[PDB]
Amino acid sequence: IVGGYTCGANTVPYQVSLNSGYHFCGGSLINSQWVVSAAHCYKSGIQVRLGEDNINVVEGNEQFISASKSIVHPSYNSNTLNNDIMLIKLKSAASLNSRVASISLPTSCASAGTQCLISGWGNTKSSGTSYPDVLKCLKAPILSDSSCKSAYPGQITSNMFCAGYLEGGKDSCQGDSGGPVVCSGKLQGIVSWGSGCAQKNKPGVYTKVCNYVSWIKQTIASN
Numbered sequence: 001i002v003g004g005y006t007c008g009a010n011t012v013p014y015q016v017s018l019n020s021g022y023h024f025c026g027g028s029l030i031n032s033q034w035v036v037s038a039a040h041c042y043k044s045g046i047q048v049r050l051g052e053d054n055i056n057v058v059e060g061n062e063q064f065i066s067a068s069k070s071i072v073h074p075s076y077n078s079n080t081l082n083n084d085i086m087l088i089k090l091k092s093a094a095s096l097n098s099r100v101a102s103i104s105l106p107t108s109c110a111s112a113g114t115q116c117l118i119s120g121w122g123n124t125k126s127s128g129t130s131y132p133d134v135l136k137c138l139k140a141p142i143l144s145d146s147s148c149k150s151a152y153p154g155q156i157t158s159n160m161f162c163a164g165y166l167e168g169g170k171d172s173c174q175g176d177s178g179g180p181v182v183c184s185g186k187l188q189g190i191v192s193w194g195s196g197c198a199q200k201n202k203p204g205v206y207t208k209v210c211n212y213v214s215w216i217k218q219t220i221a222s223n
């Protein structure tokens with residue numbers, strides 16, 4: 001997250017870190033046994049880390065649980081990033097409390113102008129590299145589809161939205177991918193892609209979760 005603020009420990013209780021020896025992507029806890037992330041974060045050997053603030057220090061609220069199954073969306077396209085969404089089943093259920101909690105799926109899609117909260121452990125610089133140990137947060141609005149398509153001609157599908165600031169300076173970044181965009185208490189986006197981070201006229205692009213609720217619910221019910 002570029003241009004954000006330190007969230008505070010366990011203030012984003014649905015945020016997870018995906019770990020394969022190191023943090024590589026975020027995700028969101030949607031019930032006690034399932035996480036949703038970005039398909040481009042797929043790899044084998046995932047440990048899901050719940051209850052994290054500092055990802056390099058054991059602080060006392062963590063739960064570390066291996067994945068048993070990963071399910072990339074049937075229609076994910078790695079070249080265009082269309083359908084950039086993946087479900088991860090935990091080997092055992094997490095213990096839920098005020099510091100480790102699920103986020104609700106949306107019943108309706110959010111409109112442009114709605115303010116959302118984006119969070120992650122990704123790079124904090126638009127030039128160069130500095131990775132934080134503690135969770136960072138950013139408040140940002142959903143942009144109109146017309147603004148989004150004008151920023152990224154030929155690249156925005158109906159399964160994507162832009163959020164952020166056309167003036168730049170505040171955005172998600174590398175290492176935030178897979179993490180949550182929460183608006184009005186519901187999961188509306190997944191950090192997906194952008195051109196650099198925090199550049200003028202290049203806001204972040206997010207997977208539009210409201211298009212996937214049926215697939216998510218059916219998949220959980222059967223797996």
Ligand SMILES: [Ca+2]
Nearest residue numbers: 054057058059
């Ligand atoms: Ca920790």
